Design a binder for this molecule. Structure first.
Ligand SMILES: O=C(O)CCCC[C@@H]1SC[C@@H]2NC(=O)N[C@@H]21
Ligand SMILES: O=C(O)CCCC[C@@H]1SC[C@@H]2NC(=O)N[C@@H]21
Ligand SMILES: O=C(O)CCCC[C@@H]1SC[C@@H]2NC(=O)N[C@@H]21
Ligand SMILES: O=C(O)CCCC[C@@H]1SC[C@@H]2NC(=O)N[C@@H]21
Lengths: 121, 120, 120, 121
């Protein structure tokens, strides 16, 4: 939690700014270096606020709908993964990016990938 | 609309409110897994979808900790709402468990849930 | 058994032979996408599944090149066969397109196909 | 193809030995450093045997059913990804590992991950 809260960057050059609340909330903004995106987007999510203390990561996830006051891609990404704490903090994720499609095109609505986030300071 | 009480093919209950500007807020009760009672969820959806017949993109997260249990895991659902007479939310999901780094390869389950407002 | 002609929810046709020791060999004809006619597939399945009621794990690949078209892409389906009166193959799939390194983030689609032997 | 053919290792320490045939076939063996696995397992797959020449990767995929003459995990993995050629050849993949389950447990049948393979020589 104080762990998770901060600024993070992934391998694409994207920026994630997040605050982890005592109640398990994640709130912040996401800026993507790629895709049909510009500026910052709201994110919201959840994390395990009482994780195991036995060397395990802390499970978390968040969503961005790719609409802000400047652009709308008619799509949303969710990241699912875990925070790994300590001096070299990482958030390791897999994600699903679903675009709104017609029914005929639903088979090709969803991209899958993986992002690694590095905490800055 | 998206706001309402939804059920998937497993009999899980997804109760959500869609805020006017894109928020999803609600509770999730899973019929399966290391879960009992309701869990907090939050997410986002496209609050100005295309007007060509396309569905409404969305996603949400549950961390599987509540007053009864903690599974040390979180699921995200990514999908789209399809309105009409038999409204549906079609999703794919990622369930990540906290693991050691070495077991990270087996940390994440993937699946697909379809939701309707029809009570089992 | 697994050997036979299968159809998914999109109306794609999956014609396969399950070899006694685990091979899957056949053809795939997709009803959607950058595809026409039949494509070669190969895969593997568990040729000695558990006897507790569990399904039979399997997977296969199609590279979307044939004599008619080349989409510069490949799909893998990972899933399990569930026998019984209404045999089913339930899958999740990954469709990777060749991309530049920089566009690799958007190289891979994911979805789910369910197959039965019922002709549309 | 001469590209793809060879020995590869991923970040877990697993070994993939493959031959790419002129007809788009992939054949070989896989040895996993992790999981319910020992020794070598057959793999088979397919690749785009006439890829684009415009800087793009070569699409491919393969499957392992985790039964060999020493062990059976009642599971199968498929890797989907692309080969990136040149002096520092890589195969970048995402994978799906489905275990056989009862119907009641099908929701938890499938793991998802990503592997990066480095060609040795
Ligand atoms: O193109 C869109 O539909 C909106 C932008 C999507 C950007 C994706 S989300 C997954 C991946 N990680 C990033 O930081 N950016 C891309
Ligand atoms: O077992 C856990 O770690 C927590 C409960 C997970 C339940 C999963 S979330 C995806 C799927 N859809 C449901 O409604 N339930 C399962
Ligand atoms: O468009 C392409 O790149 C090639 C055709 C892809 C068809 C996909 S494979 C997954 C899904 N299931 C089908 O039967 N068809 C689509
Ligand atoms: O545990 C099993 O069911 C069989 C072994 C699975 C090993 C997996 S396949 C994906 C990942 N990549 C590897 O090299 N090993 C693991």
């Amino acid at each position: 939690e104080a762990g998770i809260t901060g600024t993070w960057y992934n391998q694409l050059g994207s920026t994630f700014i997040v605050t982890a609340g005592a109640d398990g909330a994640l709130t912040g903004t996401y800026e993507s270096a790629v895709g049909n995106a510009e500026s910052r987007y709201v994110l919201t999510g959840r994390y395990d606020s009482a994780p195991a203390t036995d060397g395990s990561g802390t499970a978390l996830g968040w969503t961005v709908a790719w609409k802000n006051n400047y652009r709308n891609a008619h799509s949303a990404t969710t990241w699912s993964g875990q925070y790994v704490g300590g001096a070299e903090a990482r958030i390791n994720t897999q994600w699903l990016l679903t675009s709104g499609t017609t029914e005929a095109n639903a088979w090709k609505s969803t991209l899958v990938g993986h992002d690694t986030f590095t905490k800055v300071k």
